[PDB]
Write a protein that binds this ligand. Sequence first.
Ligand SMILES: [Mg+2]
Ligand SMILES: [Mg+2]
Ligand SMILES: [Mg+2]
Ligand SMILES: [Mg+2]
Ligand SMILES: [Mg+2]
Ligand SMILES: [Mg+2]
Ligand SMILES: [Mg+2]
Ligand SMILES: [Mg+2]
Ligand SMILES: [Mg+2]
Ligand SMILES: [Mg+2]
Ligand SMILES: [Mg+2]
Ligand SMILES: [Mg+2]
Ligand SMILES: [Mg+2]
Ligand SMILES: [Mg+2]
Ligand SMILES: [Mg+2]
Ligand SMILES: [Mg+2]
Ligand SMILES: [Mg+2]
Ligand SMILES: [Mg+2]
Ligand SMILES: [Mg+2]
Ligand SMILES: [Mg+2]
Ligand SMILES: [Mg+2]
Ligand SMILES: [Mg+2]
Ligand SMILES: [Mg+2]
Ligand SMILES: [Mg+2]
Ligand SMILES: [Mg+2]
Ligand SMILES: [Mg+2]
Ligand SMILES: [Mg+2]
Ligand SMILES: [Mg+2]
Ligand SMILES: [Mg+2]
Ligand SMILES: [Mg+2]
Ligand SMILES: [Mg+2]
Ligand SMILES: [Mg+2]
Ligand SMILES: [Mg+2]
Ligand SMILES: [Mg+2]
Ligand SMILES: [Mg+2]
Ligand SMILES: [Mg+2]
Ligand SMILES: [Mg+2]
Ligand SMILES: [Mg+2]
Lengths: 63, 394, 131
Amino acid sequence: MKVELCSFSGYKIYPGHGRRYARTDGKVFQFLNAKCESAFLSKRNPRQINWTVLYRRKHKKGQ
Amino acid sequence: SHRKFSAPRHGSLGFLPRKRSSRHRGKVKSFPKDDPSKPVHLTAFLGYKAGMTHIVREVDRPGSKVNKKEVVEAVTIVETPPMVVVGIVGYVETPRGLRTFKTVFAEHISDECKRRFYKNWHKSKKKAFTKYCKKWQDDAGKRQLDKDFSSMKKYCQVIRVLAHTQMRLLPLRQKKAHLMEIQVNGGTVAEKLDWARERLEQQVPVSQVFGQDEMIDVIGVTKGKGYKGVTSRWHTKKLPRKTHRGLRKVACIGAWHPARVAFSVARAGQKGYHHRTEINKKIYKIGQGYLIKDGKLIKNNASTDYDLSDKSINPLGGFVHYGEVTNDFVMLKGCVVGTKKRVLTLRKSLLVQTKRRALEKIDLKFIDTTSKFGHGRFQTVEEKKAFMGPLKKD
Amino acid sequence: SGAKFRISLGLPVGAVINCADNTGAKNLYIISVKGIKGRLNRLPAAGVGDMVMATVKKGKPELRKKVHPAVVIRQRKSYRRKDGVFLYFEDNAGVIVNNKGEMKGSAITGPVAKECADLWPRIASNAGSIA
RNA sequence: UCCAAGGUGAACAGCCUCUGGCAUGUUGGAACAAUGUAGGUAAGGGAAGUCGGCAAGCCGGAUCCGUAACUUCGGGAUAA
RNA sequence: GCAGCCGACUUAGAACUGGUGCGGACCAGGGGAAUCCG
RNA sequence: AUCUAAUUAGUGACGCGCAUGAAUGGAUGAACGAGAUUCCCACUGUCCCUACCUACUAUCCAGCGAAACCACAGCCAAGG
RNA sequence: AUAGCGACGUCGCUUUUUGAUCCUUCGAUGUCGGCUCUUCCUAUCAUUGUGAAGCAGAAUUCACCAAGCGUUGGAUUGUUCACCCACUAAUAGGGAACGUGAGCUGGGUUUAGACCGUCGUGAGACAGGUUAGUUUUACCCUACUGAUGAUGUGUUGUUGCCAUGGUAAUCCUGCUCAGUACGAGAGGAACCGCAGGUUCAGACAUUUGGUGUAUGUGCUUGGCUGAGGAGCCAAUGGGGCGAAGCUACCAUCUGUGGGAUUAUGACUGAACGCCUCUAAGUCAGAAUCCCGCCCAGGCGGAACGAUACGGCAGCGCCGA
RNA sequence: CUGGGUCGGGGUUUCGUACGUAGCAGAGCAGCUGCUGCGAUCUAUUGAAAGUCAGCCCUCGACACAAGGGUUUGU
Ligand SMILES: [Mg+2]
Ligand SMILES: [Mg+2]
Ligand SMILES: [Mg+2]
Ligand SMILES: [Mg+2]
Ligand SMILES: [Mg+2]
Ligand SMILES: [Mg+2]
Ligand SMILES: [Mg+2]
Ligand SMILES: [Mg+2]
Ligand SMILES: [Mg+2]
Ligand SMILES: [Mg+2]
Ligand SMILES: [Mg+2]
Ligand SMILES: [Mg+2]
Ligand SMILES: [Mg+2]
Ligand SMILES: [Mg+2]
Ligand SMILES: [Mg+2]
Ligand SMILES: [Mg+2]
Ligand SMILES: [Mg+2]
Ligand SMILES: [Mg+2]
Ligand SMILES: [Mg+2]
Ligand SMILES: [Mg+2]
Ligand SMILES: [Mg+2]
Ligand SMILES: [Mg+2]
Ligand SMILES: [Mg+2]
Ligand SMILES: [Mg+2]
Ligand SMILES: [Mg+2]
Ligand SMILES: [Mg+2]
Ligand SMILES: [Mg+2]
Ligand SMILES: [Mg+2]
Ligand SMILES: [Mg+2]
Ligand SMILES: [Mg+2]
Ligand SMILES: [Mg+2]
Ligand SMILES: [Mg+2]
Ligand SMILES: [Mg+2]
Ligand SMILES: [Mg+2]
Ligand SMILES: [Mg+2]
Ligand SMILES: [Mg+2]
Ligand SMILES: [Mg+2]
Ligand SMILES: [Mg+2]
């Protein structure tokens, strides 16, 4: 297996789940589920979505 | 006039009486052919459907791309607590068929097995087999049934062990255990019978009935769908939108002069809850149930030699609509018939198989245990807590 | 040595797709799918890596009003790899080849699916990116 | 045929409310099968369906730009 | 030409701000090229 | 000839016109048309190829309750 | 002359063409096509097994057993027919009241409104063209699909047998064989393996996708409860995301073995001293047939369990 | 001394960070001589709040309930 990270949410992707996406200019992206996929397609910036690992890291929450 | 354009007919007439099954437990219509050369062994088992999940496994088949690659496959979990052998029944061939000759029952029968003999256990006085059981502790009964054993050995050609499941260990509402006759295939009738006579009132685990990476058959009852129209019962073509008296129908029933509706014409009616036997399902893993080993319990029955975790086969929050499985289970490739917590009959293969798919060895490297009650995200609670960190609830 | 696995097919007859080469054609009107027998009322459909017949509805004048073999290299319908990943691209696109297999053009713009690549070796040589 | 409130809004449009009125339009209860009648939503394709884009769907208000052929010189025109 | 006191809805411009959402419900023209006839 | 991959369709020409033709009006033509046709863009469950959801039915029950139709009636094959 | 054809003749079969007739129906059998769906025929296009070529291979002809299984997607036309484009293995032909309108549609024929051409003095006519033109009823009987139940075994229950019915799988590609056999060359096979796919069938929901009134959780328009908070109304207010459940070649899983034999090729072997597959006897033999696997389970049976109080009582077996 | 049922508690999961309070965070504006008010929004408490079987999983926490009722059947 190659356990790997979601492009938008930043969670952990397991072999059976998720969805792959290939843009016309390369840049293969990976999504945990339709939630993250729809956010990315609607071009939501992960920095302002609260439940995202990027948002938590940027706001220094946890640790 | 002929049809302008041909098309294969919808549905199959091989399953023609599309009626609700008269039975709820799958019936073994044909047991594997007997041969005295092989040693004695059972030929069938009873399990319960729990759910489905992934497996990641390495593929070994020269020629294809998946060779030396790893793929994910859907598997179905069947909980199979060990059966209890509570009788033996003999059969003799006659020119009119295969007639039953004599049944002999064990001295001790569990009340969970005696539930099957009553339509209302609550109001009953539970008097079943009370007078029959007295035949074992007196010399009159002992010499009554020993010559019966001798007569069965002399005149019987088929021996089937009457064994019942053990629903006390299942997380189900039902306490009335199922029971069935599992034919004994092995040597001659004498040893075939004096091998069951000590298996009487004893345990039979599935690990000694089936083996790994073996092709078996599953007999069960489909999920019921009730009264369904023709377009969903037979998957006929849907009529155009301009149709006046409905469009989910079949336009022409039949010609004129046959003067009757033929049995081959699709009609509305009952869909689902049919009896079905699907062959060639491959065992992937015969799991081991929970067991207490020196105080603590061993739970890692879903831990492979490539994963080395401590996760059980149960997903997070247990199997949806079934519960959690704690007994030895059987993992089958692909989907199987029936609904959740439905009883299934496992049957040994009727055919001799010499094929790459049949003889392929199986070596799993990952069993998915994420939650099925939604989009699961974490394999186990420990890793979920490690990723999340402390919460407000503590 | 290994034939392609079945993948979902989301390009029936009548679909116009991008032409990702330098032949000058900008459209590809799927006309029929090679190797399809079909049944009653069932439209022939093509997926990644399948040879089709196509016409150019927009492009260089000499490429129009004619029937060209073509190969589909990208599709937007999600298809499942045997390893268990569902993959789908941004657009439906193909290239123009002849019956033997080599491309009429010389270069391909954008990624090329692995199923197309390992099945048509000549296209994989010109493919800038893979999967 | 006469009388005609408040808000939104161009509006006596549609929607909500006050004064006044009414008890769901000649019956109720329990289920939520098929087939209907009336509404919706659908991956990828986009008329390949059909005699025929029938039906449904797209557009839609207002402000600022821009607006062709043709013309009976007025229009076309809310062109696009 | 100024000072004071009252005032009715408009129009334009700017900053800030929201997960690009803003005629958010309701109301509310699909478009173009041609032929026949009137 | 053009339109399409493919056109008994459409448009533009050709005219020997079975049987066109000048107030039994000929030709054209802006604007208009719940008029008749063809093509293109956009859009879509028309279709590939179906699925799911909602409301009222249908369903069962309490009460209440007709009508069309009816020689006698109602399982088939062949024969005459 | 007879691989393949076949003149001049001559004998037949079929009722999927048209005729001929007028037997039934005029107190009405709804009159073209298309859509949908089932079954049947073989005069076999492909596939299985064969025999013959002017069959070297490849390709292609002719013939036999044979209808098990397939026989497509579109432009033009109301079409049936026809033609073309493309794929395919093949795009064979037909019947069932020219199958099928209380199944649809109504484009065409075939009412009443109109227009034109020809004909007529005229009203009007035209298997000439054009445009618009209400498609009713099942709750009865049967058939069919499913659902209770009845029938005997003393009453009930559990486990079972199978008489009978139904029946299902199909075709292709790639690799290897092999650039080999064959052939001067160009070209160019086959079996056995291996990997897949088409059509069909039976399931199923881990995963992907669809639905979504858990009316679950945010957002938001107009109004309303004095305001905040909390909410509500707009026949589901609208719009994101969405559990469960249903559900898609739009996801995933599975799809089988024998027997007697047909065509044909043979063995031994007479009739007919030799010869002969046939006369007696024997062999191989297939998408055919039958059965198995699979679905249902008979006014059809089997084995086994328990068999009606403690105030009454009902029962079972025995007392030749 | 066992059983289910209701409620509660955990598990899972959906959405996305609640009310209140605090902030020298806030385009700015008004009043009082730096202070006080209006102010969409932002930050912290806050992966918070809410829902979660009705056909999800476990409980051994609380509560009451459960030795019933009716009609039949004989070799
Ligand atoms: Mg046919
Ligand atoms: Mg209608
Ligand atoms: Mg789930
Ligand atoms: Mg069709
Ligand atoms: Mg009402
Ligand atoms: Mg009322
Ligand atoms: Mg009234
Ligand atoms: Mg009414
Ligand atoms: Mg769609
Ligand atoms: Mg879409
Ligand atoms: Mg068509
Ligand atoms: Mg319309
Ligand atoms: Mg215009
Ligand atoms: Mg003209
Ligand atoms: Mg007019
Ligand atoms: Mg057309
Ligand atoms: Mg013309
Ligand atoms: Mg004249
Ligand atoms: Mg004149
Ligand atoms: Mg005239
Ligand atoms: Mg009633
Ligand atoms: Mg009739
Ligand atoms: Mg009649
Ligand atoms: Mg024949
Ligand atoms: Mg009829
Ligand atoms: Mg008409
Ligand atoms: Mg008329
Ligand atoms: Mg009724
Ligand atoms: Mg049979
Ligand atoms: Mg799902
Ligand atoms: Mg979803
Ligand atoms: Mg879902
Ligand atoms: Mg508020
Ligand atoms: Mg109203
Ligand atoms: Mg959604
Ligand atoms: Mg044989
Ligand atoms: Mg012979
Ligand atoms: Mg033989």
